[PDB]
Ligand binder design. Structure first.
Ligand SMILES: Nc1ncnc2c1ncn2[C@@H]1O[C@H](COP(=O)(O)OP(=O)(O)O)[C@@H](O)[C@H]1O
Ligand code: BEF
Ligand SMILES: [Mg+2]
Lengths: 107, 93, 87, 575, 98, 93, 107, 95, 86
DNA sequence: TCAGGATGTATATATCTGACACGTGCCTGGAGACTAGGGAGTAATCCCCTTGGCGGTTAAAACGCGGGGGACAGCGCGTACGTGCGTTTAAGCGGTGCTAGAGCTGTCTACGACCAATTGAGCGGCCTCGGCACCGGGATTCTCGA
DNA sequence: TCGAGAATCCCGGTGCCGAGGCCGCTCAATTGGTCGTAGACAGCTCTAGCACCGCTTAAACGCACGTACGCGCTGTCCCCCGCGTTTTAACCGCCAAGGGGATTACTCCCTAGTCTCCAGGCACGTGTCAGATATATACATCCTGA
C-alpha cells in the first residue's frame, strides 16, 4: 500500500489535501465534490504564478534580486487585468504608480 | 501551536518561474493574505451558486463558473484552461 | 507656559501642516490651498471613527481587551477597503 | 557540590591569567603594595582606601584580570582611575589608547579633575553639535591622543568612527546602567571592539531580583559565560525563616561568598575616616487632605476608567494636584500663587513648616524627584517662597549643567536649595557645602534612592547631615515604602551579603548574622503629627542652641499674631 | 539674490521624490495618540497591538492618498491647479461617502 | 409547488401600524425581497463572526453583534433593545 | 400535550420556526443556537415596522389609502438612517426624490 | 414663447414627480437581445427579466446624471459635457 | 424558426429619451455631444450585467435567462435590485 | 413695481373595473417528548507583549518675510442649444397560433461521508552568509539668470 | 542662447541581518474499506415565449430662429511658495510592572438528532371599492408690455 500525494497525481504545487480540508470545514456546502479541490488548487497556482512572474520582472528592472512590496504594487497596478481584479485592495508598504498630470508640467 | 500558511508553496512556484529571485518575508506575507483572499472569494461564489440551484454539492463545474465570474477576461480564459487540464490529468491516473 | 505647562495642544493637531502637504505631494497635487488643512483633518477623523468603531466591536465580541491586527484587517475587509499583509 | 568551581576554577584562574589574558593568593598571586603616590598626581592627599583598592586592582591587571568596584559612595572612583592609568602608564609609559565612558551628568567634572589632578595625560570629549564632533573627529581622527572620553550613546552613533581602532583596557562608570546584556549598549560594546581589560565603577550591586548577576559576571571575567542558563532556581532560592534562610540562603549564599571573595570591593566611611557626623538617616510621616482621600476610598472613577495605571495615577495625586488643568480651573481659576497650594498636601504644609528653620539655620537642602512635572509646581511654590533655587533636571540642556555646578560651588551661594532628577542623579554632582537632603515620591528601586541618599556626607564634610523622607500615612505610598525596605530585606541577603567581602574576613560575617539579624528581626518586630515645633525642632536642630535659635520661628506658624472641589472632580472626573 | 527656483519647481522635485519611495508619511506618535483618543469614546481601557496601529496608519494614508488623486482630477477639471475645500467635498460627494 | 414568502407577516405588522392602510401587490413583493435581503446580510455576518473566533455555533450574542455592525446608529440601539426584550420574554416562559 | 407557537411565546409576528429552518439549512454555521431565531426575528420585525410606518405616513400625506412603490422610495430616501442602510439599492418603480439644484432656478 | 430654460424646469418637475419608465420598451428589448447574441446564442428572456434590465439601467443612468450635474455646476457651467461624464466615471472608479 | 442577426440597434436609445432621463436627474441644459457618450456608457453596463446573467444561465443547464438570474448579476456587481424576487 | 393674458396646474364629480382583502379545503413543516455527547464554559497557570515614564539627540516643524503666479472679476463675442411647428413613423395594443423547454416525477447508482491504520510533508528551531542599506566621493546633469 | 550651481546618478567599499538551507518532531494527510443518498437521467405535461399581423397615434424627427450662455481675453490684487532661522517634539534607547492573552483540564447541559402528531399557512376561489379616468371649472404663474 504505497502512498502518493494528490498534488503529485495532479501535477500541481498547491496542497490539494489542505484545500479539500478548507472546503469541508469552512461550511461552504454540505458535500464537497472530489474534483473541486484539484481544480481550485490549479487556479490558485495559476494566479500566483502570474503575480510572481510580473513582480520578478519588475524587481529585475530595478536590479534588485528579491521581490519587495513595492514590486507587488507595481506588478499589480501596471497589469490592467489584475488591476481590475484587485482594484479595491490596499497593499501594505505600497507606494503609488509614478503619476503626474499633464497640466502641471511647465511649458 | 503552529500557524499554517502557504509560504513554502509560493516559494516553490517562484523557483519554477525566476530561479534566481528571492522573496522577502514581507512580500511572502502579502502573497499569503492574497491567496487566502482569492480563495475566499471563489469558494464564496461556488457556495451560493450551489445554493441558487438547490444543489447540495460543490463540484468542479461550479468552481469553473465562479472562476468565470470573478476573474476578468483573459484571466478567465487561461485559468479555465489550467483547471480543466489539471482535472483531466488527475483523472487519467 | 513655564510655570504651569498649559501647552497641551490637541491630538488631531498632531497631523501637521507639512505632513498633510506631503500626503498631497504623493497624491500628485501640485499647489495646495490654505484651507485644505482643517478639512483633511475632518476627513481623517471621520474615517478613523468608522474603522475603529468596527474593530472595537469585533474585539468586544471576543471578550478581549486587546485590539489586534487581525481585527482591524477585518473592519477594513468589511468596509470594502481590504488591506493585505498583516495576516 | 559545585566545588569544581573551586578547584577547576582556580586552575582556571591559572588559565585566564597565564594562558588567556583561600583565594587571597592564587588569583592574586602576583603581589605588591606601595603607599607612595604617582609622580603625576598634583595637589592631592592619600587616604588608605584608594591605596589598598589601588594595588588590589593594579594587582588584577598584573594578574591580567578585571573586576567590579562595589564601594559605597564618595570614595573617589575618579582618583582611583587617575592613579590607575597615571601609575600604570607612568610605569609602562604606553599611555594609550584607552577610553572611559561616563555619565552625561558628569563630563566637565571629569575634565575638571583631569585638569587639576593631572596635567600630563590629556583626553578628548564628545558634546554639542555633530559639527563640533566633526572638528575633533576629523582633527584627532588620526589617533594622536592619550585617552578617549565619551558618553553612553555616542559610542553607538560614533561606533562606526571609533570602533575601527584596537583597544586593551576600557573603563565604564555607573555600571548599574549595564544590567541586561540584551540592552543595546552592552551588545554594541561586544560587537563594537575588543579591549582585553574592563572594569565597572558603581555605588551598588545588581537589582534585588538578581537574574542578571549572570550578565555582570559575564562582563567581569570568563568564568560563567558558558553555563549561564542553569543556576537560576538554585541561586534565586534566597528570594521557617531559620530553615528557609538556613538551607536556601545559608547554604547557597555561603557558597557564593566563597565564590564572590575575589571580585567586589567596598567599605564604609567610618573605615576610612570616622568623620561621618552621624548615621544621618531619619524619616518622617504626613497625612493628605481628605479631599482626594475620599477618592482613594471609593475609587469608582479610578478602577473601571481616560485613566490608566491607577497606581501611577495615585503617585501623581499622592504628591500633589494641579497636574491637570481642570484642578486649577474649578479650583484656582486665576492660577496665581495662592493658598491651598500649600494647604492641599502634607508635603507642602509641613514643607511650609520646615521653611523657616531652613532659612533660619541656613543649612542647605537638596530636593529630589522621581517624576518630572512635580518640580514645576515646586518651582512656582518657591516663586511664592521667594528664596532662590536652581532647577536641574534631565534633558534640560547640555553645558548649563556645568554652569549651574559652578554657580553652586561658589561659597557665597545665596540660594540654599535646588532640585535634581533622581534618574539623572547618577553621581551627577559633588556636594560638600550642604547637609540636609530631602527625598520625595517612591523610587521603585532603592539603589537610586540610596544613590542620591548619599550625596550629602562627602569627603571633607564639615557639616552634620540630617535627612528626612516625606510620606503621607494612610496611602499607597507608605505601602510602597513597605515594599521598598522589604527589598532591603531581599538585598539584605544579597547586597548586604555581597558588601562585606573585601579582604575575605572571618567573624565579621557572623557579626552581621547576629547584629544584622537583630536588625531584620527588629523590623519583624515592627511588622509583627509633628505639627508642634517641639518634635520637628528636636529631630532637626542638632544642638540645644539650634533649638534656641528656632524659638524666633515660634512667632508665626505657632504664635501667629473643601467638599465642593471634590464634587467638581467627581462630576468632571465622572467620565 | 541667492539662487532661487521659480515657484513650482521645488514642488515637482518633491512629487518625484515621494512617488518614488514607500515611507510612511505621518510621524508615528502623533498618529498613535490620535487613534487612542478616538478609541476612548467607544469602549474604555483598550490595548492596541502596535501592529494594529501600524495597520490603521497604512490604511488611512492610502485613503487620503486616493482622495487627493481624485480631488486633483476635479481641480484640473475646473482649470485651476490648486485643490480647494469644495474640490474635496465634491470628491466625497461623488464617491458616495456622504 | 408552493413558493413561500413573508407576505402575510408583513401584512400583520402593517395592521398593527396603520389599521387603515392597504399595501399593493408590488409593494408586498418589495418588502419581501427586502426582508430576505436583510436576513442574508445579518446571518452572513453572524456566520463569519462565528468563524473568526473558531466557535462552531451561531448564538444570540453573535446576532446581537452583527446587528450592531450593519445597522447605522439609532437603528442599532433600538434594534438591540427589541432583540434583548424579545429573547428575555422568550425565556420567561 | 398542548401546542403553543414559538412566535406566541416570543411575542413576535415573524415565524420564528421558519427563521430557524433557514438558519439551519442555509449552511451558515454547523449548529444554530436556540435563541438566535428568536432574536433575529425580533430584529426583522423592528426594521419592517420602521419602513412600513414611514411609508404609511408618506402615503397619507399624499391622501392615498394604500402604500405603493413610490411611497417606499420616499420613505426610504427621506429618512437618513435607512438611506445609509439601503444606499446601494435600486427600488423598482422607484422614482426619485424631487430635487432641483440652486443655480438652475431663475433670478 | 417662454424664455429658454423655463420649459426645462417645468419638465424637471414633471418627471421627478412620476415613476414611468423613460425608455420605450421595444428599442430597449432589441438592444438587450443584440448584446446577448455575442455571449451565448439562442437565449430566451422572460419578459420580466427585460423589465429588470430596463429598471436597473434607467436607475444607473439617472444616478450618473445627478453626479455629472454636480461636476458641471462645480465648473460654473450649467451644461453637462462629455468630459463631465468621463470625469464622473473616473471618480467612481468605473474605468 | 429564424433569428435575424442584429446591428445598429443601440440607436434604439433616442435623443428625446436621453433628454428625458437627463431631465429626471436634475440636469438643466444638455450639451449636444452627451448622446454618443451615453450610448457608450449604457452599452458597457448592459455588456457586464448580461454576461453575468448568461453565466448563471449556462451553469444551470437552461437556455433561458430569468429574472432571478439578472437580479443575481446586479446583486453581484454591487447594485442591489428589489421587487423582482431573490 | 403693475397688469392681460395665455398656459399649465390643481379641484370637484360621475363612472368602471380589475386588484385586493377575505373565506374555505388541504397538507406538510413546526412543535413536543426523549436521548447522547461533544462543544462550550470555567478554573488553573504562566509569560510576553503592553503600558507608562525619563534621558538624550536631531531632524522636522513653526515662524516669518518677500514676491511671483494664479484665482477671480468683468466684458465682448458667436455659436451651439432650446422652443415651437408641421410631418412621419415606429411603438403599442389587441389579437392569433405554434411549440421548446421549464418544470415536475420515478428509477437506480456511482459516489462522497465516515471511521480506522499508518507515516512523511510540513512546521519550528537553529545556523549562517550575501544582498542590500549605506556612506562617501566622484562625476554628470537640469534649472535657472545676463 | 552660454555659465553656475544646486540636484541626482554612479563605483566602490563596508557591515549586518534577514533569507535560506538544514534538522528532528509530530499531526494531518493518505489508504482502504463500507454504506446511504443526492443527483443523474428519462419521461411526461402544459406554459409562457416567440412570431406574426392589423390597426391607432404619441412620439420622434427635421428644421427654422432667436438667444444666452461658453469661452477667450485682460487686469488686478492677494496669498501660497521658497528660503532662512529658532524651537520642540518625535525617536531611539533605557528603565520597570502587571495584566490580559494565551494555553491546559474537566464538566455539564444544549443541541442535534429522532419519532409522533396537527394546525398554521398556502392555493384557490370570490365579491367589492380605490384609484384610475373623464368633463368641467377655478386659479397660480411666467412672459411681455408699461
Ligand atoms: N585623597 C583625597 N583627598 C581629598 N579629597 C578626596 C580624596 N579622595 C576623594 N576625595 C573627595 O572625593 C570627591 C570626588 O569623589 P568621586 O570621584 O566623585 O567619588 P566616586 O567616583 O567614588 O563617586 C572629591 O570632592 C574629593 O573631595
Ligand atoms: F562621585 Be563621588 F560620590 F563624589
Ligand atoms: Mg562614578
Amino acid at each position: 500500500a504505497k502512498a502518493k500525494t494528490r498534488s503529485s497525481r495532479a501535477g500541481l504545487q498547491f496542497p490539494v489535501g489542505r484545500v479539500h480540508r478548507l472546503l469541508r470545514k469552512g461550511n461552504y456546502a454540505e458535500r464537497v465534490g472530489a474534483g473541486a479541490p484539484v481544480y481550485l488548487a490549479a487556479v490558485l497556482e495559476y494566479l500566483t504564478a502570474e503575480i510572481l512572474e510580473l513582480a520578478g520582472n519588475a524587481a529585475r528592472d530595478n536590479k534588485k534580486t528579491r521581490i519587495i512590496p513595492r514590486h507587488l504594487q507595481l506588478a499589480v497596478r501596471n497589469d490592467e487585468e489584475l488591476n481590475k481584479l484587485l482594484g479595491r485592495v490596499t497593499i501594505a508598504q505600497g507606494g503609488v504608480l509614478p503619476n503626474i498630470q499633464s497640466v502641471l508640467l511647465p511649458k | 501551536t503552529r500557524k499554517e500558511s502557504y509560504a513554502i508553496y509560493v516559494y516553490k512556484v517562484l523557483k519554477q518561474v525566476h530561479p534566481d529571485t528571492g522573496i522577502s518575508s514581507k512580500a511572502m506575507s502579502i502573497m499569503n493574505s492574497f491567496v487566502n483572499d482569492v480563495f475566499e472569494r471563489i469558494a464564496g461564489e461556488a457556495s451560493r451558486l450551489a445554493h441558487y440551484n438547490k444543489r447540495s454539492t460543490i463540484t468542479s463545474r461550479e468552481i469553473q463558473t465562479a472562476v468565470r465570474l470573478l476573474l476578468p477576461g483573459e484571466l478567465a480564459k487561461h485559468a479555465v484552461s489550467e483547471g480543466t487540464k489539471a482535472v483531466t490529468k488527475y483523472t487519467s491516473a | 507656559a513655564k510655570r504651569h505647562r498649559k501647552v497641551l495642544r490637541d491630538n488631531i493637531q498632531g497631523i501637521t501642516k507639512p505632513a498633510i502637504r506631503r500626503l498631497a505631494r504623493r497624491g500628485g497635487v501640485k499647489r495646495i490651498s490654505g484651507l485644505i488643512y482643517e478639512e483633511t483633518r475632518g476627513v481623517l477623523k471621520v474615517f478613523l471613527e468608522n474603522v475603529i468603531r468596527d474593530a472595537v466591536t469585533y474585539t468586544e465580541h471576543a471578550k478581549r481587551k486587546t485590539v489586534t491586527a487581525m481585527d482591524v484587517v477585518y473592519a477594513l475587509k468589511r468596509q470594502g477597503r481590504t488591506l493585505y499583509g498583516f495576516g | 557540590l559545585l566545588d569544581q568551581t573551586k578547584d577547576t576554577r582556580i586552575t582556571h584562574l591559572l588559565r585566564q591569567t597565564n594562558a588567556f589574558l583561600d583565594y587571597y593568593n592564587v588569583a592574586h598571586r602576583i603581589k605588591e603594595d606601595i603607599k607612595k603616590q604617582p609622580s603625576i598626581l598634583v595637589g592631592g592627599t592619600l587616604k588608605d582606601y584608594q591605596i589598598k583598592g589601588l594595588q588590589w586592582m593594579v594587582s588584577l591587571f598584573n594578574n591580567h584580570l578585571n573586576g567590579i568596584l562595589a564601594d559605597e559612595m564618595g570614595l573617589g572612583k575618579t582618583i582611583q582611575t587617575i592613579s590607575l592609568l597615571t601609575y600604570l602608564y607612568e610605569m609602562k609609559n604606553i599611555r594609550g589608547p584607552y577610553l572611559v565612558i561616563v555619565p552625561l551628568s558628569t563630563l566637565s567634572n571629569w575634565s575638571s579633575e583631569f585638569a587639576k589632578w593631572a596635567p600630563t595625560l590629556r583626553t578628548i570629549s564628545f558634546k554639542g553639535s555633530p559639527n563640533e564632533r566633526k572638528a575633533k573627529q576629523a582633527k584627532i581622527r588620526a589617533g594622536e591622543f592619550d585617552v578617549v572620553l565619551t558618553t553612553f550613546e555616542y559610542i553607538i552613533k560614533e561606533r562606526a568612527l571609533l570602533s575601527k581602532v584596537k583597544w586593551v583596557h576600557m573603563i565604564i562608570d555607573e555600571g548599574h546602567r549595564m544590567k541586561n546584556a540584551q540592552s543595546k549598549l552592552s551588545l554594541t560594546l561586544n560587537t563594537h571592539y575588543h579591549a582585553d581589560y574592563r572594569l565597572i565603577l558603581t555605588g551598588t550591586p545588581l537589582q534585588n531580583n538578581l537574574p542578571e548577576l549572570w550578565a555582570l559576571l559575564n562582563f567581569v571575567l570568563p568564568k560563567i559565560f558558558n553555563s549561564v542558563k542553569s543556576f537560576d532556581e538554585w541561586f534565586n532560592t534566597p528570594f521557617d525563616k531559620i530553615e528557609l534562610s538556613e538551607e536556601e540562603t545559608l547554604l547557597v549564599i555561603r557558597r557564593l561568598h566563597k565564590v564572590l571573595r575575589p571580585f567586589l570591593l567596598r567599605r564604609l566611611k567610618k573605615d576610612v575616616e570616622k568623620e561621618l557626623p552621624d548615621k544621618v538617616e531619619k524619616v518622617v510621616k504626613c497625612k493628605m487632605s481628605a479631599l482626594q482621600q475620599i477618592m482613594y476610598q471609593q475609587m469608582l472613577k479610578y478602577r473601571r476608567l481616560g485613566f490608566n495605571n491607577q497606581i501611577m495615577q495615585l503617585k501623581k495625586i499622592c504628591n500633589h494636584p494641579f497636574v491637570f488643568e481642570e484642578v486649577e480651573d474649578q479650583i484656582n481659576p486665576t492660577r496665581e500663587t495662592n493658598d491651598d497650594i500649600w494647604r492641599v498636601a502634607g508635603k507642602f504644609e509641613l514643607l511650609d513648616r520646615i521653611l523657616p528653620k531652613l532659612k533660619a539655620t541656613g543649612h542647605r537642602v537638596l530636593i529630589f524627584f522621581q517624576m518630572t512635572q512635580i518640580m514645576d509646581i515646586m518651582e512656582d511654590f518657591l516663586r511664592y517662597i521667594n528664596i532662590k533655587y536652581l532647577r536641574l533636571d534631565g534633558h534640560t540642556k547640555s553645558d548649563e549643567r556645568s554652569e549651574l555646578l559652578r554657580l553652586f560651588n561658589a561659597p557665597d551661594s545665596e540660594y540654599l536649595c535646588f532640585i535634581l532628577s533622581t534618574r539623572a542623579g547618577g553621581l551627577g554632582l559633588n556636594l560638600q557645602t550642604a547637609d540636609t537632603v530631602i527625598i520625595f515620591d517612591t523610587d521603585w528601586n532603592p539603589h537610586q534612592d540610596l544613590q542620591a541618599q548619599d550625596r550629602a556626607h562627602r569627603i571633607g564634610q564639615k557639616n552634620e547631615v540630617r535627612i528626612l523622607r516625606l510620606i503621607t500615612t494612610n496611602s499607597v505610598e507608605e505601602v510602597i515604602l513597605e515594599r521598598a525596605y522589604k527589598k532591603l530585606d531581599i538585598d539584605g541577603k544579597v547586597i548586604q551579603a555581597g558588601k562585606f567581602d573585601n579582604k575575605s574576613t572571618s567573624e565579621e560575617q557572623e557579626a552581621l548574622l547576629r547584629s544584622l539579624l537583630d536588625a531584620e528581626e527588629e523590623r519583624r518586630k515592627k511588622r509583627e503629627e509633628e505639627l508642634k515645633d517641639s518634635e520637628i525642632n528636636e529631630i532637626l536642630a542638632r544642638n540645644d542652641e539650634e533649638m534656641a535659635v528656632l524659638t524666633r520661628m515660634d512667632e508665626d506658624r505657632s504664635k501667629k499674631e473643601k467638599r465642593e472641589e471634590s464634587e467638581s472632580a467627581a462630576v468632571y472626573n465622572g467620565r | 539674490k541667492p539662487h532661487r527656483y521659480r515657484p513650482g519647481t521645488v514642488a515637482l522635485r518633491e512629487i518625484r521624490r515621494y512617488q518614488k519611495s514607500t515611507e510612511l508619511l505621518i510621524r508615528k506618535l502623533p498618529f498613535q495618540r490620535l487613534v487612542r483618543e478616538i478609541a476612548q469614546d467607544f469602549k474604555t481601557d483598550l490595548r492596541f497591538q502596535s501592529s494594529a496601529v501600524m495597520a490603521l496608519q497604512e490604511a488611512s494614508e492610502a485613503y487620503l492618498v486616493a482622495l487627493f488623486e481624485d480631488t486633483n482630477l476635479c481641480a484640473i477639471h475646473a482649470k485651476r491647479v490648486t485643490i480647494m475645500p469644495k474640490d474635496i467635498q465634491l470628491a466625497r460627494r461623488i464617491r458616495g461617502e456622504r
